Ligand binder design. Structure first.
Ligand SMILES: N[C@@H](Cc1ccccc1)C(=O)O
Ligand SMILES: N[C@@H](Cc1ccccc1)C(=O)O
Lengths: 278, 277
């Protein structure tokens, strides 16, 4: 209660996401995605911040089976423009830096500053760990690339904010809670995430979508999954604008039901203002 | 003759490499970026990249990183994940008190946990659990991991096909450095491609119309956000066929009318696993 679980360690971007999307809430680090969900299921946390999409690259969990099983429900989403800081020890400076420690992907994103300062790349497991290691070692020669939060929590100094050579990466998250008794009341500005299955024949998916197109309903995400021991059908996770008990989505879903099987609502939640921000 | 994979020795990805390319030296890499880098740099011929799981699993996002390493999907592989209960040399089922494995695996083997009255101890992955059980001398600790993990860590298999409650199958892309030409037109091929359509109702629907009426069957489809730009959406699509042969050839020309920046990520044989009971 007032606790939000996330996957990773303190100062991870997921941690920052929690503090961005729910300021004042205590964040609960979990090492595994399964533990993150388990925290909410068991009552150790109210919410879970689960990564779902990255514009460039990232590690995201497969929620298609695990989330409905043990009965979570997407009650929100959150967008994060990932901001890389170059972190050093309290008394350090840019000139001291010789070796740079961070995640493989981050290292690619900051190739400019590596060449600029002539640094030696040292790839670590994640960004938060690189921040922790730089603190632990106490060497001014070693710097980290990690979140500004990782600097705060480990008492490191920010040698430079915004080290990305371009905007590069944005991360989208689902915010999941224990399944609520009723859905949010019909209204504008809602999103809906659902599962459905169609057969393995040419226009099977196409048909299922027909009702969405002619009804003017816009899809924001779609992703297919294999079925265990069957190549005869295919399951889909779909994000669509709207609320299932309000037009124009309500009728569109009735049509979808005619051309699909085992439809299931994973979440009905407010669409983030980030979607309409320049 | 070297194939890179993500994980540590005895991981199911490692087993996949040995299944799909027997006799090839496998190159463990800790990160997905390192796995692709190995092929880009010439440290490996191929890369075994996990792409799908029927139940659950950790898969990389290849949509940007793979084309940008200049790689190209030249094959696929399906693996029915087979869990072995592993103990230290000379141990037995009776000795076992604690059981170590990945969260998902632990769920799949709830039967044997209750059967032997074991204490579940969840680890990061299966290969690590095998390594830990070896490292710790202790007959009280057993692992659930691949048969390969047992071999490479000198552990004994206490039971070979530990029944899963709900089984898992893992699908992989096999990527190499972009070849000069495509495989010659013929039957049994699959094609993976990237395309973009606009953020309007029916945009995707239109792009697919040409596939449906042309009798071309899709096996996978997955959307991605575009950095900044909230105006279009990129898709990865697996479809049956070869882009220089009907019925796919013409279907793709139509798809091009309703989409942008079409790109072939791979053209590769469809695994016999797709038609196996
Ligand atoms: N094979 C079906 C369903 C499907 C669509 C897309 C991806 C995977 C499966 C079709 O072509 O419509
Ligand atoms: N929004 C477009 C394309 C799209 C589909 C699915 C996910 C994202 C984008 C449509 O409704 O057809």
């Amino acid at each position: 209660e007032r606790i939000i679980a996330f996957q990773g360690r303190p100062g991870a971007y997921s941690d920052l996401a929690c503090r961005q999307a729910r300021p004042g809430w205590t964040t609960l680090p979990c090492q595994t995605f399964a533990q993150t969900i388990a925290a909410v299921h068991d009552g150790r946390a109210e919410l879970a911040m689960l990564a779902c999409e990255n514009s460039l690259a990232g590690r995201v969990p497969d929620i298609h089976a695990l989330l409905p099983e043990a009965g979570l429900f997407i009650v929100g989403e959150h967008f994060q423009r990932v901001e890389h800081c170059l972190l050093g020890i309290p008394g350090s400076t840019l000139a001291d830096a010789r070796r740079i420690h961070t995640h493989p992907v981050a290292m690619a994103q900051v190739r400019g500053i590596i060449t600029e300062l002539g640094l030696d790349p040292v790839v670590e497991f994640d960004t938060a760990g690189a921040a922790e290691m730089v603190r632990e070692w106490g060497r001014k020669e070693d710097v980290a690339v990690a979140s500004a939060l990782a600097a705060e929590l480990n008492g490191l100094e920010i040698l430079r904010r915004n080290v990305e050579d371009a905007t590069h990466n944005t991360t989208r998250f689902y915010i999941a809670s224990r399944r609520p008794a009723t859905l949010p009341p019909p209204g504008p500005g809602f999103m809906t995430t659902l599962l459905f299955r169609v057969n393995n024949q040419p226009g099977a998916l196409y048909k299922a979508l027909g009702g969405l197109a002619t009804a003017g309903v816009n899809m924001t995400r779609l992703e297919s999954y294999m079925l265990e021991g069957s190549f005869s059908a295919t399951q889909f996770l779909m994000d669509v604008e709207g609320h299932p008990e309000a037009p124009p989505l309500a009728r569109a879903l009735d049509e979808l039901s005619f051309f699909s099987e085992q439809q299931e609502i994973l979440g009905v939640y407010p669409a983030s203002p980030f979607r309409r921000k320049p």
